[PDB]
Amino acid sequence: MAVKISGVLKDGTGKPVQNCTIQLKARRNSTTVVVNTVGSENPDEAGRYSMDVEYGQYSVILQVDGFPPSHAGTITVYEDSQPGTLNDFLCAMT
Amino acid sequence: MAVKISGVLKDGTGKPVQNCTIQLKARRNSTTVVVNTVGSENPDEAGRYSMDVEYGQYSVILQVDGFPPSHAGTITVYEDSQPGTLNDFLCAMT
Amino acid sequence: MAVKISGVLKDGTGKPVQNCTIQLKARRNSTTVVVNTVGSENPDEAGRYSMDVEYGQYSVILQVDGFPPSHAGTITVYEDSQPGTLNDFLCAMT
Amino acid sequence: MAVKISGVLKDGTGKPVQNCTIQLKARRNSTTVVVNTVGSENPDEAGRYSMDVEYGQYSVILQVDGFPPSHAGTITVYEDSQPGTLNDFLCAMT
């Protein structure tokens, strides 16, 4: 199953960030994802993003049209996670 | 929420600075801001600035047209912070 | 005898991978295959793959148009193996 | 408030110095001036200069089309100083 990861993506001054590109980098083999595979997603102009993420361990990469990739960190989804925003997984007590 | 930061910024000789821009770079990802994201604002011709800032720790950069980028310092916006000028956050005890 | 390897190939965000290529390298020569021989097959537009592999040890290579070759890992198919996705074969205990 | 620094600028032969530029490089964060902000002031043909200086610590630089920028020294304006000339601030007992 795919857990829904949804939210809005704002910069540090309360405005949406445009030209974004969010990438999920698999680091270990899962039941349905092969290692070293990237899954991309492009937010809209208002900053809304929504993805269907398969469980496993991933590295998050954020690219904004003139930014070298910003390694936000590693997220992990098990068979107990509930739908939420991307930021909670980064801030979650791993 | 967001704390409102408003004021006017000048130089030693009591004049507004022109063609400048303030950039806040988030050095630690938060519940609403992802790490390593810059949010910028250009003051008006009178040097007046006004912007809504999300909580967390930020690094402040001033860029003036021609001059090398200046690293003013680091600010921290907590849940108990009250509105004020940008200078007080720089001068706040750490 | 050739075990049937069937499945669908997706990434972290639950989408098929296009322009992909799956290669199997015979690591150790067997009574049916000769060592250092590559066998590859391109999945369809929906990311569905089905191959008939001979038994032995193989190293799996994932090739994507644009990215450098990925080293998924190593599979070892015995005479007693049952049909299934290659994801189970990489994640099988060794 | 701004202390009013006024005077005349003469060289060693008792003559006005032209094509000058007095700049104030702020070295510490103040309640009204951000770090590394320069404010220029060009005196008239008779060597008269007058500036309104916000209190704090400054490094005075005197740039003439000729000798490289001459570091006159560091000046400091508390909230007790009275209006005067820049030479007294340079020569004041720190």
Added chain:
Amino acid sequence: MAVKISGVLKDGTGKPVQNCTIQLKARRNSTTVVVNTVGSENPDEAGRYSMDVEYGQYSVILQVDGFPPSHAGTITVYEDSQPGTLNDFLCAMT
């Protein structure tokens, strides 16, 4: 006498491999073969191969216009062997 070697050459995915070339590099002087002599014989489009090997010691080279020559291993033909496939000679207990 010439031992007949016959078989079908397949890659890891149970398919014939085309454009190949099997070379037998003789490493030791035999009664009828001089050292460092090669014999090339290309199999058909269905992967069928057959040679008339003279007894002795040989190194097998599999050249497939691609990966460099693949030293599959030394074969040895005694004067008590029976006709078979090349893979058995590779896998034979030396």
Added chain:
Amino acid sequence: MAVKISGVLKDGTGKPVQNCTIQLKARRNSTTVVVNTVGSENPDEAGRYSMDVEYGQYSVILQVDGFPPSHAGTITVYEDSQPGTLNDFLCAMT
């Protein structure tokens, strides 16, 4: 108040020097002269010079059209000084 420094400046053989230039460089800033400020006049065709020198310590440079700059020495005009030739100030006891 500027001491008057007047006289005639000749060479070893008793002739006036033409195309000359006398430069005073303030090595230490005073209440009326800022540090590292140069003052120069060209003497007349007869080698006669007249100066209104502010109090303080200066370094004297002799510049002739063609020769490299000469370093005559250092003078120090106190408050008890009296008008006289420049040549005495270098030769005064220190």
Added chain:
Amino acid sequence: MAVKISGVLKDGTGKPVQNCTIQLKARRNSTTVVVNTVGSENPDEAGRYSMDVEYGQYSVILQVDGFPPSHAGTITVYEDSQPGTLNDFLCAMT
């Protein structure tokens, strides 16, 4: 006299070798052959060769069009030697 050396020249797979050349370099001067002298003669398409060789020690070279020269070994034709193929002398006990 001359010992007769007649036979056919096959390769590992039982085929004749074309564009071949046998070279006999005399490594020790004899009653009838001076040192460091070669004699080269071309076998036919069937691979047959016929050589009347004088006594002494020789080094045998196979030169086949395209390949680097091959050093088959060294032969020693004595007075008690009987006619035979070239392979027997190389394979003879030394």
Added chain:
Amino acid sequence: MAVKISGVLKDGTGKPVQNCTIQLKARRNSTTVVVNTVGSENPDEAGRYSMDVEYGQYSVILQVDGFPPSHAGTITVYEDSQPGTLNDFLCAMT
């Protein structure tokens, strides 16, 4: 006052030297001559020279558009001397 120095400049064969030039390099600050000042006096075709030197210490340089400047020696015009020739000052017991 100026000490008159006159004479005739003859080379080693009792002949006048032409195209000559005598320079007096002041080496110590005097009451009437600034340090590092040169005064030339070109003799006539018959080798006669006559100068009006001031008191002090001088280095005599002899430039003859040829051999490089010849540092003859240092002359001191003590304020008890009487007019003479240049050679007497060189030969004088300093």
Added chain:
Amino acid sequence: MAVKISGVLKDGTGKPVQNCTIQLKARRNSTTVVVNTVGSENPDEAGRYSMDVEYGQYSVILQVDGFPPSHAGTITVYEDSQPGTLNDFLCAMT
């Protein structure tokens, strides 16, 4: 007197060797030959050679258009030698 050295020059295959040239490099002064002198002899198409050698010590160099000069060795002719072939002098027990 000159001893007659005659014979037929054959290679290891038992054939005449054409395009040859035999040279005798004298290494010590003799009664009739000065040291470091070479005398060439070109055999005919059937390999026959015949020279009239003066007694002494020589080094024989057999040069053919091809392989580099092959120094067969040293020959010595004393006042006891009988006419023969070149090969005997090489093989003679010196």
Added chain:
Amino acid sequence: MAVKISGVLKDGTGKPVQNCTIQLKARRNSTTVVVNTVGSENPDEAGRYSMDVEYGQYSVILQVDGFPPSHAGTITVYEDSQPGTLNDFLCAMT
């Protein structure tokens, strides 16, 4: 006073020296000749030379058109010296 230096200039084979030039260089400055001053004369076509030299130490140089400058030696002509050839002065006891 001046000593008369006269004579004829000859070489080993009793011949006049043509295109010659005699140079006297004042080694030590005296009451009549300044130091490092050269006085030269050219002998006539028969090699006859005559000059009037002042007292002191001189280094004598012979310059011939084509040959490198020769350093004949050093002469020391005194107050009591008698007229003669420069050969005697060069050969005089020192």
Added chain:
Amino acid sequence: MAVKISGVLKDGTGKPVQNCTIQLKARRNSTTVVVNTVGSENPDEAGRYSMDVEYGQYSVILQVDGFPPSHAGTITVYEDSQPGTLNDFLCAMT
């Protein structure tokens, strides 16, 4: 008195040497020959040479058109020597 040296110089194969030249170099000056003087003679078409040499010690050089100059050796013609070939002088006991 010049001893006459006459003879014919051959090579190993009993032939005259053409385009030759014999050089005698005097290595020690004598009462009739100055040191380092080279006297040469070209033998005729039949190899016959006839020279007459002065007494002393000489180095004998052979020069042949095509080969680098040979160093034949050393001879010493005394006052008691008898006319003979050049070869005997080389072989004479020393």
Added chain:
Amino acid sequence: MAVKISGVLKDGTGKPVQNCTIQLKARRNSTTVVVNTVGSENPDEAGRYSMDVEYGQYSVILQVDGFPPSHAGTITVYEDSQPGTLNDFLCAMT
């Protein structure tokens, strides 16, 4: 007085040597010759030379447009020598 040196100049093979040039390089100052003065003398086509040498010490150079100048040696002529050939002076007991 000049000693008369006369003779004939022959090489090692009893023939005159042409194109020669005898040079006398003086080494010490004499009463009539200055150091490092050379006097040439070209002999005629018959090798005859006759020179007049002033007494002293000389080094003899023999330039023959060939071998570089040859140091024949030192010749000393006192006021007792009698006329003779150049070779005797070289061979004379020094």
